[PDB]
Design a protein around this nucleic acid. Structure first.
Ligand SMILES: Nc1ncnc2c1ncn2[C@@H]1O[C@H](COP(=O)(O)OP(=O)(O)OP(O)(O)=S)[C@@H](O)[C@H]1O
Ligand SMILES: Nc1ncnc2c1ncn2[C@@H]1O[C@H](COP(=O)(O)OP(=O)(O)OP(O)(O)=S)[C@@H](O)[C@H]1O
Ligand SMILES: Nc1ncnc2c1ncn2[C@@H]1O[C@H](COP(=O)(O)OP(=O)(O)O)[C@@H](O)[C@H]1O
Ligand SMILES: [Mg+2]
Ligand SMILES: [Mg+2]
Lengths: 330, 327, 338, 282
DNA sequence: GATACGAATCTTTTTTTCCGTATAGCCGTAGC
DNA sequence: GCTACGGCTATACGG
DNA sequence: GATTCGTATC
């Protein structure tokens, strides 16, 4: 049919989980018509698009939505000219008259909503043009900005738009949703499973749902009818096995450049991601009590520098080798 | 239909006496109006300080009923290129007054987004037709304006809103909406406002939405922190105490527990720790440098994103290493 | 043609170098209706593209390899003609950002909008070449058009892939085979075409000289076979790419001579390598690793070399002109070795 | 490589009008045109290689004399000529009879880049005024001719509409219906509608909608058929419809649009086909 | 005759506005 | 007296 | 602005 991420997308504002504050504000906005300009920001896969789509569904319904909603994302041109003509013309438009069915089954607010998804990719000039467009036509048009990086939104727009931070979906946040999805999809797992899934999927429910779907597909292919263990979850998540990490730590402990270089070459021959192994090394070194305070401070700074370098799309091999060499000389 | 509006565009001042905070600027422009002479005004300040509201109320006060034809307002939403400045602005500030005498008012909202050629053409229009037309320039960044344009414009600085203006506006909003606010929540709201009225209005609207039943219910600091998702001062103090005094494992545990209790963001904790450490007395001057530099790169990396736990451990290690210089 | 595509496993069951990955692919292909977007990451030359083609054959049946090469025209914001080649096939599309530079956003935008209008699988080779804007369009394109399109992109070192895309995909790892498996594949090749093969040790030598690369090992085997008059010798020399030899000579010159004139000669060598269209990131990688195999350098020199390599490859990733960072890295190595 | 032909407009009106319409269409479409002089027919091709292609077939019986000889297969002489020079020559020759005459137009291929010696006579009033012209052309190679082919059209969802002849009662009304969308200045896309007979011209945009519909009688020679095309091609279709009595419209669902014009010379019939690609997807 | 002076060489492939041309639409006059 | 076509002009496009 | 070669002048 459809992937579990799109199959279990929330339809109402009640299905959205762990984001209680924004959901409650939008629900009280349903009973009123003083909804302000919203700025949805947070980690990826936290449910901002799902929340805005659910609110849009509840406000107008399937019929008035096509006439009362304009959606622009990163897949379409959003230059200064586009903002100055299309957005301004849509905001200047008169609100469409609801039908009897719409006015009898939906609140039908006297405004319309312009949704600008992936607003972090918008240039500063477009936002500057957007400022007075939202301010002048606030009583006839509402604006929603969705992004992951708040700093990419200019200060005047962050001032005009109400800020709604979306919390990262940890284990306790989305364990109920994952359990509901597993029960509805008939997935059997051991105790502690789906918790390792939400731990690996740090602040992401989409990745956790995809991992659960992949584990279920693997179990169905096996056909043994056995519960999914945490070992399989870590394997298809890309988590380095603990034996390999232990060997990495042991070879780092002996500060030999040649042995470390050979083992790093063999390790990157296995295709392991540098980000995951760096996170695992960070967890191992910070968690372990065999190291003193100075070593922990230096290792934290080194891991921060390595993570920042890796996030810039650099070479995984060079960064991992340099990090391990620096650890061996600590 | 003012009840169908966001609180930011619901309490926009209509008269000059409804604008709080900038008492000096309001008094100066009122004296200008009463004397009958108005120079080429230039309003500068951070967003939300009340420049557009002030100039709109001033124009309404000058032209009570002829605001439609005596005021030409252009902003970044409309094209303000060389051709628009050459034709439309000149045509407006080239004809005589209709019947109101006085002068014609041209407001250039967000003039920092205008091109340099447009400002170069505008300076001669400003200095040429000043007998019957006065220009007002609003901008948040003065570096994007031509120095000649700043030379021919009288500069007015809009300071961030002081405490008392925020208290008065919040009291007016509470009276209008029949809402209650605890003094602790009042202090929390002003601190997060950062001299911005729009932030205060948005947070107040979100807090009224947060309450299950708006009347008979007070808004406490817990409501503020739950609606806006900001760390409590007690949480920041506990995190700083754990980082500064406790060992590495328990400090990491405390940071993780504090962050997972309410879903707090690491950048908010970083800002809180920066604000608290500014009040600290450091006798080495190297701890200050280490703290500022390490926290700056950590904040920048958070802005670009990455591993969150690694960034938190980096914050803890940076604070510990910086405070190791105080020996 | 060449032996690389002569013995390319067309079917899913013909893949015999990963085993567990083959089982996982069979699990994915059991029910293709719920197949999500796939992202394959691993060492270059492992066979990720072969796995993708085998999966597509396992889903849509034989016929995916019936490639027609087409010519497409695109226009950017300004008036411009973009002659992008499209290698489409039944229920399969191929897009690569190699030919197109910063204009890679509008081409993928138009192509995915047209194809997205059962589903049609789209393959994006070298997913790391996108400039963080095609990715911005792609995340919404696959999130909203998941019903009528599926995205399967292969890549190596997926660090420059943005977080939302990685969150929107299934992460599939393709480790490189061991030396024994490469030797077994070469043995099958030479059984299909007899090459004398005096000693089994030379197959292991070829496998070890490729660092887990099937394509490089097969190219080496074919080169030695054709040069040695359809035969093989135990003492036959190991053939290596020309730019590898040039980088090794550059490393030898850097180790021997450390001066400004030697710096200018190194700059000329780097300019020749750049003119040969070799990416500067892997140039820095190979130069750094060739410096580390020098036996006359102590541990402090190697640590300084690797630190400068990390700093300068980050700078090259955040840079515009690649010659500045390469020259800086070489000069730093020279100033550290002296 | 010996090409020579003679055209007499007054002797045969209909085929001369067909040739003039083809020249006007290829001139209005784009600069330069492809003249394929096969031994039994002349094909005039305008290949931009989204923009449309015009494929007009002119039989050899149209011209009074059609000696075509070349070393290529079936004496295929292919040439590229500027339409503007040919259009000017044809306008001069048309005004020659308009002022009163019956002289023939002799065309010879006089010398890869060559020129046609289009010479004719004119008599003012009993004076002899020889009009001589030389239009520079290039000679397309044999393989280059093979690279140009008429695009075949699938019939899986393609549906034919027999547009009314312009000489009939409904012809003027249908011409007005076709040109009803041309009076809008800010139109670039026309989205056609046929459900299974009606022809609807729909121009939907951000803040305005258009619903031109044909309520008159129509025939389909022997299900929804929608295709959105540019306005400039629709102008060419309207121009072709006025000059041809037998006009056939073919609409493919989200694939293409075909404007077929036929001149019944019976004798081989002269036909004009204007293949139009959809400007964008439904 | 020594020196100051001069020549030759050391080199290249998004957004706004503006200048001139293309083109379609409309009005005025010759002809049917 | 009406229509067709040529000349003049306003507007969009391109580089 | 630097180098190298050639003239006119002191
Ligand atoms: N709070 C939530 N409750 C239920 N499902 C959720 C929640 N948050 C995320 N999801 C699921 O996450 C998947 C993707 O959600 P989206 O809202 O489209 O992602 P996102 O928040 O837009 O992140 P982006 O697009 O990378 S900025 C869907 O399958 C949702 O069901
Ligand atoms: N001094 C003030 N007194 C009362 N309300 C204020 C004051 N300053 C700002 N506000 C409120 O904040 C809203 C936004 O302020 P504006 O004056 O419209 O914008 P601005 O201050 O010009 O900031 P920028 O630079 O244009 S983004 C107003 O509509 C008022 O509701
Ligand atoms: N299981 C296998 N058995 C034999 N040869 C293989 C196998 N997997 C890959 N290859 C060889 O690898 C060559 C190319 O690999 P490729 O798919 O280009 O790797 P990558 O996807 O990493 O670029 C093919 O010519 C094929 O012969
Ligand atoms: Mg989203
Ligand atoms: Mg303003």
């Amino acid at each position: 049919q459809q992937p579990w991420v799109e199959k279990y997308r929330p339809k109402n504002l009640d299905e959205v989980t762990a984001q209680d504050h924004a959901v409650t504000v939008l629900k009280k906005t349903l009973k009123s018509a003083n909804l302000p300009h919203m700025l949805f920001y947070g980690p990826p896969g936290t449910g901002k698009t799902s929340t805005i789509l659910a609110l849009t569904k509840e406000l107008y319904g399937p019929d008035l939505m096509k006439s009362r909603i304009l959606e622009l994302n990163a897949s379409d041109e959003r230059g200064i000219s586009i903002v100055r003509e299309k957005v301004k013309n849509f905001a200047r438009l008169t609100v469409s008259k609801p039908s009897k069915h719409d006015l009898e089954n939906y609140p039908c607010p006297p405004y319309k909503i312009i949704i600008l998804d992936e607003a972090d990719s918008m240039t500063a000039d477009a936002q500057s043009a957007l400022r007075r467009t939202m301010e002048t036509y606030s009583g006839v048009t509402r604006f929603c900005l969705i992004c992951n990086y708040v700093t990419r939104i200019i200060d005047p727009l962050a001032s005009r738009c109400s800020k709604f931070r979306f919390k990262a979906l940890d284990a306790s946040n989305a364990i109920d949703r994952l359990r509901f999805i597993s029960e509805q999809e008939n997935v059997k797992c051991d105790d502690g499973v789906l918790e390792r899934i939400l731990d690996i999927s740090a602040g992401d429910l989409r990745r956790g749902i995809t991992l659960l779907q992949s584990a279920s597909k693997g179990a169905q292919y096996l056909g043994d009818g056995k519960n999914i263990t945490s070992t399989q979850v870590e394997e298809l998540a890309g988590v380095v096995p603990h034996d390999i990490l232990i060997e990495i730590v042991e070879k780092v402990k002996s500060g030999d450049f040649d042995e470390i270089k050979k083992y790093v070459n063999t390790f990157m021959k296995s295709g392991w991601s540098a980000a995951s192994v760096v996170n695992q090394l960070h967890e191992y070194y910070i968690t372990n009590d065999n190291f003193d305070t100075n070593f922990k401070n230096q290792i934290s700074w080194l891991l921060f520098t390595t993570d920042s370098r890796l996030n810039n799309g650099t070479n995984e091999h060079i960064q991992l080798l340099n990090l391990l060499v620096k650890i061996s000389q600590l | 239909s003012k009840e169908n509006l966001p609180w930011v565009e619901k309490y926009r001042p209509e008269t000059l006496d409804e604008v709080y905070g900038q008492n000096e600027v309001i008094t100066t422009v009122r004296k200008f109006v009463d004397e009958g002479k108005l120079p080429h005004l230039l309003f500068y300040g951070p967003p939300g300080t009340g420049k557009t509201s002030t100039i709109v109320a001033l124009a309404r006060e000058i032209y009570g009923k002829n605001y439609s034809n005596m005021v030409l307002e252009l902003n970044a939403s409309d094209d303000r290129g060389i051709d628009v400045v050459r034709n439309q602005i000149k045509d407006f500030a080239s004809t005589r007054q209709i019947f109101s005498k006085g002068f014609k008012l041209i407001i250039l909202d967000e003039a920092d987004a205008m091109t340099n050629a447009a400002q170069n053409a505008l300076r001669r229009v400003i200095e040429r037709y000043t007998k019957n037309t006065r220009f007002c320039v609003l901008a948040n960044y003065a570096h994007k304006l031509t120095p000649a344009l700043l030379s021919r414009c009288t500069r007015f600085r809009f300071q961030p809103l002081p405490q008392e203006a925020i208290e008065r506006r919040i009291a007016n909003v509470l009276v209008h909406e029949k809402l209650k606010l605890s003094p602790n929540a009042e202090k929390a709201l002003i601190e997060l406002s950062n001299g911005d009225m729009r932030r205060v209005l948005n947070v107040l609207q979100s807090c009224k939405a947060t309450l299950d039943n708006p009347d008979e219910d007070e808004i406490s600091d817990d409501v503020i922190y739950e609606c806006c998702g900001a760390p409590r001062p007690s949480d920041l103090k506990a995190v700083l105490k754990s980082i500064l005094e406790d060992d590495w494992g328990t400090a990491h545990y405390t940071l993780n527990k504090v962050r997972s209790a309410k879903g707090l963001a690491l950048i908010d904790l970083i800002e809180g720790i920066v604000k608290i450490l500014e009040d600290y007395e450091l006798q080495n001057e190297e701890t200050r440098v280490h703290l500022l530099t390490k926290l700056a790169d950590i904040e920048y990396s958070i802005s670009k994103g990455g591993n969150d736990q690694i960034q938190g451990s980096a914050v803890i290690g940076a604070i510990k290493a910086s405070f190791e210089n105080e020996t | 043609s060449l032996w690389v595509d002569k013995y390319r496993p067309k079917s899913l069951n013909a893949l015999s170098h990963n085993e567990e990955l083959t089982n996982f692919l069979k699990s994915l292909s059991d029910q293709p209706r719920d197949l999500p977007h796939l992202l394959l990451y691993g060492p270059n030359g492992t066979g990720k593209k072969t796995r993708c083609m085998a999966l597509l054959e396992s889903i849509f049946g034989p016929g995916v390899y019936r490639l027609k090469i087409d010519v497409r025209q695109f226009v950017t914001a300004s008036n411009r003609k973009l002659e992008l080649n499209v290698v489409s096939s039944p229920y399969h599309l191929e897009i690569t950002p190699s030919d197109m530079g910063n204009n890679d956003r509008i081409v993928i935008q138009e192509l995915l909008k047209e194809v997205a209008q059962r589903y049609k699988c789209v393959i994006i080779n070298e997913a790391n070449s996108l400039t963080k804007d095609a990715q911005a369009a792609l995340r919404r394109t696959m999130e909203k058009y998941s019903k009528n399109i599926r995205l399967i992109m292969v890549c190596d070192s997926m660090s420059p892939i943005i977080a939302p895309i990685k969150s929107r995909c299934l992460l599939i790892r393709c480790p490189a085979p061991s030396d024994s498996e490469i030797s077994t594949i070469l043995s099958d090749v030479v059984t299909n075409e007899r090459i004398q093969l005096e000693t089994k040790d030379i197959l292991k030598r070829i496998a070890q000289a490729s660092n887990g690369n099937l394509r490089v090992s097969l190219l080496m085997l074919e080169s030695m076979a054709l040069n040695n008059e359809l035969a093989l010798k135990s003492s036959s020399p190991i053939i290596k790419p020309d730019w590898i030899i040039v980088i090794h000579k550059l490393t030898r010159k850097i180790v021997k001579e450390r001066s400004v004139n030697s710096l200018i000669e190194c700059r000329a060598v780097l300019y020749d390598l750049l003119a040969h269209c070799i990416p500067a990131n892997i140039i820095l990688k190979e130069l750094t690793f060739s410096l580390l195999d020098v036996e006359t350098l102590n541990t402090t020199n190697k640590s300084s070399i690797i630190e400068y390599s990390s700093v300068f490859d980050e700078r090259l990733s955040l840079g515009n002109k690649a010659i500045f960072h390469l020259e800086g890295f070489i000069a730093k190595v020279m100033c550290c070795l002296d | 490589m010996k090409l020579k032909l003679i055209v007499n407009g007054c002797e045969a009106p209909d085929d001369y009008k067909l040739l003039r319409t083809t020249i006007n269409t290829v001139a209005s479409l784009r600069k330069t045109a492809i003249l394929r002089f096969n031994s039994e027919r002349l094909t005039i091709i305008s290949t931009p290689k989204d923009t449309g292609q015009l494929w007009c077939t002119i039989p050899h019986d149209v011209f009074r004399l059609y000696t075509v000889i070349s070393a290529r297969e079936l004496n295929t002489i292919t040439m590229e000529c500027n339409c503007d020079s040919l259009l000017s020559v044809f306008k001069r020759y048309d005004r020659v009879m308009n002022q009163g005459s019956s002289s023939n137009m002799t065309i010879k291929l006089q010398s890869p880049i060559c020129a046609l010696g289009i010479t004719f006579e004119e008599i003012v009033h009993n004076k002899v005024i020889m009009h001589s012209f030389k239009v520079p052309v290039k000679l397309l190679f044999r393989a280059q001719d093979t690279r140009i082919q008429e695009p075949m059209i699938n019939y899986i969802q393609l549906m034919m509409y027999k547009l009314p002849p312009i000489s009939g009662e409904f012809g003027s009304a249908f011409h007005g219906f076709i040109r009803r969308v041309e009076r809008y200045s800010n139109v670039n896309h026309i989205h056609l509608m046929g459900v299974k007979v009606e022809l609807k011209i729909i121009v939907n945009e951000l803040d305005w909608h258009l619903e031109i519909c044909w309520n008159g009688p129509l025939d389909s020679v022997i299900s929804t058929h929608e295709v959105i095309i540019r306005c400039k091609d629709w102008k060419v279709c309207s121009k072709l419809y006025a000059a041809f009595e037998e006009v056939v419209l073919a609409i493919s669902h989200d694939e293409s649009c075909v404007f077929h014009c036929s001149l019944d010379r019976g004798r081989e019939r002269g036909q004009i086909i204007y293949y139009i690609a959809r400007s964008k997807g439904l």
